[PDB]
């Protein structure tokens, strides 16, 4: 095989949340942001060379919610079986003092596609410059997700990626700090 | 470049 493009979408009841996104060989090309009703491109560049009518996607998402309810009943309402994440915290590039970089909290192999993720610099939450990706599809029909925290490698600081997914008993913390 | 095509979802209740 050489490449694979996947139009991937999903609806989740009772949370009533869905997602529409195109995946090219593992990475996200774009995805329709339900709320804003607009399509979002992973890389600015991508948009300047192609387009998609967000609306049409919001159309599928809805027929999905439908087919879902029919598929629920048809199986005597058997719920999904939670599958706990698998978190790893890597640094984008080799970390060297006072030199800009990014922390990647990489959450893998889970489902249902629902999880709260918090960055903590020395046990306190951080809400800035941080960024995440939508829920990316896996060949096993689970999900993968990414979180970003650009930082400045300091010798005195310590970071923690707290992840809470329903399949976890208590929250989960992956720890990181300069000098393993 | 150009424009993306998406297959449409069709449902059938039985």
């Amino acid at each position: 095989e050489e490449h694979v493009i996947i139009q991937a979408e999903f609806y989740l009841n009772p949370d009533q949340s869905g997602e529409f996104m195109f995946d090219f060989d593992g990475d996200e090309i774009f995805h329709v942001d339900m709320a804003k009703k607009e399509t979002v491109w992973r890389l600015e560049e991508f948009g300047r060379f192609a387009s998609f009518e967000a609306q049409g996607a919001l159309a599928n998402i809805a027929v999905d919610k439908a087919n879902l309810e029919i598929m629920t009943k048809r199986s005597n309402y058997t719920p999904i079986t939670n599958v706990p994440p698998e978190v790893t915290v890597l640094t984008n590039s080799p970390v060297e003092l006072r030199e800009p970089n990014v922390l990647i909290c990489f959450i893998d192999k889970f489902t249902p596609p629902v999880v709260n993720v918090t960055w903590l610099r020395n046990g306190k939450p951080v809400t800035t410059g941080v960024s995440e990706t939508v829920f990316l599809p896996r060949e096993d029909h689970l999900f993968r997700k990414f979180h970003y925290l650009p930082f400045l490698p300091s010798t005195e600081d310590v970071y923690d990626c707290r992840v809470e997914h329903w399949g976890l008993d208590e929250p989960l913390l992956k720890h990181w700090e300069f000098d393993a | 470049g150009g424009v993306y095509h998406f297959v449409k979802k069709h449902v059938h209740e039985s």
Binding site: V4, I5, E9, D15, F24, M71, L90, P94, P112 | -
Partner: protein, 189 residues
């Protein structure tokens, strides 16, 4: 929160072999975590993997016309979407940023660990080689595997565990489809 969740997952896959010389199309209807309904461009009709899809399959397979149209996707949908942006995907190319450092410096009297850290290169395909005095270090090498950063770039780390001699010149050679000639960085004593 324990109230049951029900998930619907729809996947439309376009598999390309040899550019677009041989395309394949798939539709996977998924419930929670199992695939029940599936259209294969190579089969022509829908197949119900699990009894959950049974109805659907037989209902669509009766519409021979529609069942035909779906075979067309390999062109109307797949091959079309392919070119709509091969410009920024098939042809994406970000040059690897290689750096070679060794874990623990002080340790140059005994066992050490040299690290080749390839970062931010795009086309997943890459290949690293560890040269101890221009001589393939065919073994005793440990790799991180390929790592997806999620931002259309990868990174990987290949380390060499060796006893550092003040003369031996270990080199890391990186070969990736974004550079005319191989990328090499050296490190010795």
């Amino acid at each position: 929160d324990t109230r049951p969740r029900f998930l619907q997952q729809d996947k439309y896959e376009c598999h390309f072999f040899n550019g677009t010389e041989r395309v394949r199309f798939l539709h996977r209807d998924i419930y929670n975590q199992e695939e029940d309904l599936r259209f294969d461009s190579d089969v022509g009709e829908y197949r119900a993997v699990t009894e959950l899809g049974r109805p659907d399959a037989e209902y669509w397979n009766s519409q021979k016309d529609f069942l035909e149209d779906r075979r067309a996707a390999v062109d109307t949908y797949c091959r079309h979407n392919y070119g709509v942006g091969e410009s920024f995907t098939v042809q994406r190319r970000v040059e690897p940023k290689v750096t070679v450092y060794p874990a623990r410096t002080q340790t140059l009297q005994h066992h050490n660990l040299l690290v080749c850290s390839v970062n931010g290169f795009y086309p997943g395909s890459i290949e690293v080689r560890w040269f101890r005095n221009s001589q393939e270090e065919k073994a005793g090498v440990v790799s991180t595997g390929l790592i997806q950063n999620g931002d259309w770039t990868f990174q990987t780390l290949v380390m060499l565990e060796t006893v550092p001699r003040s003369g031996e010149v270990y080199t890391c050679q990186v070969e990736h489809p974004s550079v005319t000639s191989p990328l090499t960085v050296e490190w010795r004593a």
